[PDB]
Amino acid sequence: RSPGVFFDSDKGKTHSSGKVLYNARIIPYRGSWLDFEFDPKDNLFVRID
Amino acid sequence: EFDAIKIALASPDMIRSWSFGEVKKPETINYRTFKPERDGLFCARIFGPVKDYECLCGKYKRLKHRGVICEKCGVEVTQTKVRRERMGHIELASPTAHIWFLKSLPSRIGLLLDMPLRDIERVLYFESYVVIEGGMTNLERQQILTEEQYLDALEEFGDEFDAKMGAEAIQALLKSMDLEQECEQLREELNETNSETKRKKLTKRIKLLEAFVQSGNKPEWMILTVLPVLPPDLRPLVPLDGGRFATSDLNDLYRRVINRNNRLKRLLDLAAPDIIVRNEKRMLQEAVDALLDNGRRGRAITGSNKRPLKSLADMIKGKQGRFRQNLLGKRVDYSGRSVITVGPYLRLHQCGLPKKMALELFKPFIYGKLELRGLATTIKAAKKMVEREEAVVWDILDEVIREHPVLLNRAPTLHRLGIQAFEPVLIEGKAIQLHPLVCAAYNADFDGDQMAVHVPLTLEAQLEARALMMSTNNILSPANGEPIIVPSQDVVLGLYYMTRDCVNAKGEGMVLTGPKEAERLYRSGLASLHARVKVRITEYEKDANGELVAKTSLKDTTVGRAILWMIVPKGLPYSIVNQALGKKAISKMLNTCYRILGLKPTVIFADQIMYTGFAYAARSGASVGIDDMVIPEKKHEIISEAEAEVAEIQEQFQSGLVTAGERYNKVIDIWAAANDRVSKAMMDNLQTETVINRDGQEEKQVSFNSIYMMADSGARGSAAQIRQLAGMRGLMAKPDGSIIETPITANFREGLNVLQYFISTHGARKGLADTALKTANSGYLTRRLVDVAQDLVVTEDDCGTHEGIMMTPVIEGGDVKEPLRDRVLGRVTAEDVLKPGTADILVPRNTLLHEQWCDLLEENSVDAVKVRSVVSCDTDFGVCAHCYGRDLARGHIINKGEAIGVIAAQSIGEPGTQLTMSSIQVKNKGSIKLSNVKSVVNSSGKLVITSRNTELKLIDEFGRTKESYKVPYGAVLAKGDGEQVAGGETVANWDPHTMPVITEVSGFVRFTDMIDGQTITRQTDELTGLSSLVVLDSAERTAGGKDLRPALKIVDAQGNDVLIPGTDMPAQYFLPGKAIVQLEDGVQISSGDTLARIPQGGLPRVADLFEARRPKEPAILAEISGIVSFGKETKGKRRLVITPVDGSDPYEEMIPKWRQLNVFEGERVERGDVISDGPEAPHDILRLRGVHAVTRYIVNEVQDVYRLQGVKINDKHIEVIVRQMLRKATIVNAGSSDFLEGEQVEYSRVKIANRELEANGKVGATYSRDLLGITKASLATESFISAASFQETTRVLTEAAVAGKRDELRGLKENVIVGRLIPAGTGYAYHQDRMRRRAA
Amino acid sequence: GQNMRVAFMPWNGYNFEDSILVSERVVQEDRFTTIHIQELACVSRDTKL
Amino acid sequence: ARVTVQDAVEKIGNRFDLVLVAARRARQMQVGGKDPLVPEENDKTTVIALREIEEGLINNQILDVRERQEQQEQEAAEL
Amino acid sequence: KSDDVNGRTKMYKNIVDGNHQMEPGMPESFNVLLKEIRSLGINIELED
Amino acid sequence: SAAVKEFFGSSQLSQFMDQNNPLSEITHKRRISALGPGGLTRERAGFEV
DNA sequence: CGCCGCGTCAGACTGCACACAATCTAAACCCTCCCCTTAGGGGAGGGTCAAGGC
RNA sequence: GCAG
DNA sequence: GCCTTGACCCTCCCCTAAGGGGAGGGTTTAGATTGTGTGCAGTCTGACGCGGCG
């Protein structure tokens, strides 16, 4: 997978409500991954590695 | 030798008693002279001598003085194999928690001290204190103190109280507890509160405390003060060839434990500051935790590879542990392997074994015969003789393989016909020559397949290979009963070509004296093999006594059917060959020979069929050319018309009249119609394209096309592949499943162009990857099924039970998917089945329904037979042979001692690689029947049902049911109850997009608290012209009538309460929101018209059926039979009540309101009625509808998956797995017994306990049987060896250890692990002798 | 590979289920005879004896 | 010789019991001087044992009473 | 055939003697397993 | 030198060459691999990749 | 008491071939104990060889 | 890396 | 034939005089330095259970 920012989803495969949950993911060539995502309550969260 | 296996915790004195000395140094060996160092991990003095009968310094060297301990260095003089047996021990400077009893959830040290795992971990990692006893102070026992709280409460309370930290503290707590006082206090605190999950936590802890009291285990032994050291020959430090060494990772882990232990002893002798000794105690705790189970607490210790170290727990756990890599299957001597190749000259019972493999697999046998016959003076001379391959060892070798069978095995051994014994025939090649008929059983093709040869050594193994496993004993499949040694591709094409008929074939119409004259004509060239002739055939019928009687008649046959008659055994009709024999006709011919004449003539018959099919397939020269794929000339016209139609739909879409959605849908459907028109034109042009002459006049016949003969014989391929050869290859699907809107209009006889080929690969790689990743999904299901059923053996002959399941033909809507005969062939009846004319017993009570009895049942019209099943069998620990029924592979009742659990699990799991990943129209005549009949007559004279579990069956004129549908509640039925109809007669009408409120009785409309504005929105539309109402939903109304729900009542024109028939309670319609009310208050409604309208697989399916996985949206069921009522709605989770007639009424629910409830208020329900709808959960089916109900549900829902894919598995095999799932019970009322309430016991245990209680008059326990999926039922066996070798070894072993379990080795995995005979089969007699000589 | 003369026909069971029935002239003519070269090493080491 | 054991299973109505009886008999004739009760047509002792089962010359009861008889006759060699 | 260390040599010399009879013991890998569970501080035994 | 030595000798992508015929060589060189260090694992690689 | 987060637990079977891991640091004192240096001596432990008598 |  | 009997004879272990050579173990080192860093992996999904937590 190329380095860059990749926007993806899980297509309602969580919380049984069929709610599509989005997440960006910054993937570098070397270094720490940085993800942003949505929870089922529509709150933007962030993960590092 | 030993009758059981006992596991338990290890006392430190017990550990010091295993050991032969303390390991004081990490020294493994010396580096210059590699002798083992003193007091090291490899010590000759502790663990015994490194050479056989030899002291380490060499002062004592021979077995003259054996067992003496050399006083110079204390190594004994004995065999060196004692280094595999003698353990040592490390005396830990500080205690150390055993990680298995600290971390394996639920934590036993946490469960015992009633202390959460985070507080325990904070105590032992030297972060917090804990007051091991308070005394006369305000500090209770388990109260943890942080540093400063302890620091001050020191000088407030002096040294009265005692608090500690570290595993010394946890050991002081575990030693300082009194178990019986705690368990009795837990019992009195149990009998006080009725909180369900708190009572369950208390019962968990009670069972743990009493398991510590029963067993000899002391709690404080969960904290290591002595460590055992594995014997050194099991963690070897061995010299490799290159002068380098190779070691086990346990030497690293033990070495680290010893280092940190010795440094801890030095820090204690130096009186280091306490930061340093605490750090060293944390590090010793870490090192012991890494030795026992690496990587469980935190981070794995990697050594010298950045690859984790393999700890003691990883040696015994997983796909690479001892249990699965070395105990349940192992590498085997006297075994070879080679490529398989055909050899079709063979008989059914023989394989071809190369001489070069047989000389090596049979080497001791040849040495024996070489010395016995005097050809070698010495076994060394014999070794040299077989090395030189002298000409006499080939005669000896022909002598020693003579009647000696070998086992041939092809992996994956999906089912028991994957290992079969054949007599060897020595051949010259290097490839095993496998007789063709057995290949279908092995799943073997000769494209590179290799098979493994094994040699039965003893006489018992030779007789089991002869008598149980020889391939002439396995001609029937253990799954369905159908023949598994059955002709295939070349044989069936030869026999189909032989038994066909051409119209004007050479030598037609002549009259023949018999099959021999037909063979003479055909070999002379004077008659074609397809010449329709008149031949005198003598055939024998089996008389009623059993003997054969002849009959002789000129039959109208062809020459080839006459030739084929010469190989047919005697007791068979001539009509069995007087037809064109495809694959199914030959399989039925073999089955007929088996059922009429038995095994011995069938084997000869099958070999004769193979030889004659091979021969006459060769004679035909049936070849595939490119002209055999005849493409219809109407293909280009069909495709051009379809392209015209799709272009019309496209330019209509430019006209906007259609959405892209229906444009796409219509383009797909008008290409699918083109694909079927092309396939019909192709097949019609292909299948009769022979038009030939009789007496000049042309006449069409079935085609002699090679492609069509191969498809039509069942030899290879189907019409679905001839479609892609000669028709078009149709619409493809994208990788995400959505099908591409333009098809591959081309076929493989033409070219696929580059784009169509790319589109083709889209789905071809999906199929190949599915195949690659579903074998691991099916093999794991098979493993789980074998491990849930491994210990089921037929142990009795008759349990004397009278129950059983009611077998009926399965009818899904309007067609039988499985007739009664296929479901009761071979089972044993449980009650007298009698004719539809009653009291005439057709079949007696305990008969095996073999084919004669099923033919008798089909002469009559019996539609249901109550038949013995294994879920209904009274035998505890096993099943009786009558409840099981027929042995599918022999065709008689099953012998006592058969391991039917492994057969059932292999029969279910072997086909697993073939699986993946409105109104009612009567079809044909019959009397209409309804069940759950509650009917009224509507305004128009129809019938309308007042029920929700009513279903519409169709009784035939003979008495049997031929279709059955399920009608929604209040469907209007155009045809009444008990009337005759014909094909297409639509009976029941409704609309699925809404649900009506059915009028109870005829009367006038009134509003019971249906307030204008509070419970409705008044609406006005112009299409019908009338005003109407909508009942208000939750979030759109006021306070008030959202709480008090709207109702409508029946009042006549006089103002009187009109009633329902039979009951004079007020009859109401309690309407929920989202309802459409288009009737007015005071309108006359006859009973039956609408008052309001409210709008609305594969291998994982089998896996989560047998795993009893609860569906995501479970259909709610009615627990107790009563009347529905409602509690606090609009909460987010409503509350429902059911009111019985003569029972305790209040029974609550937490039904979430976001799912439509499918019953109404006034009516009654019963146990099992679906309140809501959805996929049913098997636990609910078991609790509410019974045991036989969940049995019927599981077998129907698994056979639904296996019947799409055309797989024929019997239902015994699913009923066996269901019986092994219904193996536990939960005590609800303890009775006069020793079982506690609410604790889960083995079902046979509580059954024999009740039996001995009621034998002495006392009252027995009452139980609720439970449904555990195959994994949770495999891990809940009464044997920790079975459950520990299945999976989750750590949980099974810690639970069994603290409970002090005892494995009596009753199943088959425990007897395979210890190297004993299995208690099933030929080892069943020995185990019965063992249990009749030790119990007495 | 080599340009072999094939006939597509079932022959007496000997090409059942993907087997191939080769003539003897394919062996006389050394058509599919292939040379294979193995290297075998004998290592004289220094041992402690 | 032997290609199918089905006739011998009708005398000993089981396959597992047949295996055990024929193994006991085959060990009698193999390590033991006990000669066959049928003509030994170049057969191994497993197959001769089966060919004796098939003619009713051997079953568990027959082998048991022979064990009793010859055991009495050779332990009563009290001199 | 596999693990019995004393049973495999008895089986060999029995085959060479013309006596196709086994004297099976305990598989050695079961003994390895018992010693690898007893080194975990768990007393696993064989009850006579 | 040890970094490049372990890469060229011990990496998953540094493979023993197929040398059956010329086609095996020239198609082993034109080979793309989703696996390797920094890529997928053949067990955890899904259906969609 | 119902829910969300977190941890744990699984994930086909035989076969060939190949082949591990690769970085990573003190010196100057002293001591004891063992084996070695010549050209054979000394002796315990254990066989062997012609002779003789029974 | 591959074979079924 | 059955014995003895003195004379030989072999191997092997240790010893010589005055240290040499090495192995394998101890011990102190006095300007002053006072918190680990891989340019890591993190990338597997689904089921289940249990525990904080509102």
Ligand code: 118
């Ligand atoms: C470790 C071990 C096996 C698998 Sb997979 C799998 C997983 C995700 C997506 C596709 C495949 C597997 C197989 C059966 C049941 C459950 C998981 C797998 C197994 C064998 C070969 C290739 C992939 C995954 C991790």
Ligand SMILES: [Mg+2]
């Ligand atoms: Mg194959």
Ligand SMILES: [Mg+2]
């Ligand atoms: Mg590989």
Ligand SMILES: [Zn+2]
């Ligand atoms: Zn010694």
Ligand SMILES: [Zn+2]
């Ligand atoms: Zn029964």
